[PDB]
């Protein structure tokens with residue numbers, strides 16, 4: 001069967017109505033939700049490394065970051081590591097890649113590609129330029145075309161145009177359809193400027209209240225690093241915030257945070273609307289063409305994002321809003337339609353599961369395993385009850401310390417080792433646009449554990465690591481985290497300073 005893998009950029013699960021967050025009363029994704037009403041909504045899908053390039057590498061390879069070597073936004077994915085597309089080409093599929101690529105190297109293993117180029121692979125919201133192999137008289141990365149209009153509209157037209165005029169109608173196709181929205185700074189199409197103009201976006205209480213959240217690793221001893229760690233919505237963080245970026249000055253510091261939250265969320269949801277409106281045009285074409293009944297469709301985001309919760313922004317954090325990815329699959333031949341699923345899955349599991357759903361076998365060389373049996377009503381054999389996470393990009397871009405962690409259905413334990421893996425990067429500025437105006441440095445940050453009871457406290461408001469009545473859960477989770485790190489091979493032999501910190505904190 002055909003496969004269309006749709007992925008959006010920073011489209012987090014709270015901003016999708018089918019996940020029923022406090023934002024769901026705004027009805028932000030009516031078309032995505034309709035697809036979910038005829039498919040499976042995976043409630044426990046998680047990123048292993050919440051940034052675009054590492055997450056997109058885990059999806060393509062089905063392997064953890066330390067195995068594909070794409071640790072941060074600074075690394076490249078080898079052309080020979082394009083396992084997902086290659087495995088579909090082996091099965092006789094024609095393959096196409098459209099939209100945001102962000103894997104640095106050429107999508108050479110795709111028969112057709114037309115991917116975003118400018119701004120380090122992030123693209124532009126208006127008149128974006130693409131690198132494509134329909135201009136075959138040039139070579140990567142000089143095979144550039146220009147387009148007219150808004151990126152979400154242009155990208156949707158590229159995919160539909162390929163399906164209509166370039167696709168071989170007698171071969172099954174595997175298409176990766178990647179959007180650039182709703183990425184910052186959320187430059188929505190001008191036709192949405194007054195969408196949600198007179199509607200208040202529901203505000204979480206964690207935006208203003210953070211008592212019990214965090215530790216010395218994320219706030220410092222006696223809250224001395226509240227100005228230093230974690231970019232904010234309020235003017236808490238001294239160097240980067242939405243209140244400062246939006247130049248909001250009410251006189252009341254709390255109303256500053258509120259207005260910056262409204263602006264951040266409305267501009268963001270305006271981009272989400274543009275994606276959702278475009279998907280109606282794509283889904284209408286697939287239905288009219290008759291591909292709706294023989295095409296497996298996936299909607300996901302490369303990672304989640306903090307939408308102001310705990311006065312945080314962006315991703316990278318292991319916190320559930322950034323760690324969890326939205327993941328909706330419609331298998332038109334499965335009886336699992338209009339249901340939710342609680343299975344703990346990862347983005348590294350996407351590739352082998354999609355290979356088996358298309359009539360293949362889960363590749364042995366991948367860390368991820370197939371959960372295709374879910375679409376047959378079965379629980380996969382010996383499936384994990386825990387997930388591994390690691391953010392490597394210490395301090396850079398958003399002043400977020402590197403950390404590892406493990407998450408079960410009931411508990412989450414985070415270990416911040418607060419150090420960058422590259423010694424040459426230690427000591428250097430974290431934000432390049434403030435290299436002149438005084439940015440923070442990629443320095444060592446306090447090492448500490450954070451522990452959250454996901455059944456009593458799913459919003460992760462209360463760190464209960466120092467709590468004595470959780471000290472048995474604490475020792476238990478520290479054991480599973482050490483063996484999970486051991487089982488996946490992320491033992492940091494390559495990095496001595498980091499190995500000593502993690503090994504000594506676990507033992």
Ligand SMILES: O=S(=O)(O)OC[C@@H]1O[C@@H](O[C@@H]2[C@@H](O)[C@H](O)O[C@H](CO)[C@@H]2O)[C@@H](O)[C@H](O)[C@@H]1O
Pocket residue numbers: 009010051052053073102119120121122183184314315397398
């Ligand atoms: O692609 S994402 O992971 O969804 O976004 C990550 C972004 O990282 C920083 O933006 C930098 C730019 O400052 C730099 O010029 O180019 C690189 C190209 O990868 C990134 O775009 C953050 O400043 C941004 O907020 C975002 O988190």
Ligand SMILES: [Ca+2]
Pocket residue numbers: 009010051052302303
């Ligand atoms: Ca992203």
Ligand code: NA
Pocket residue numbers: 151152153155179180181
């Ligand atoms: Na887009």
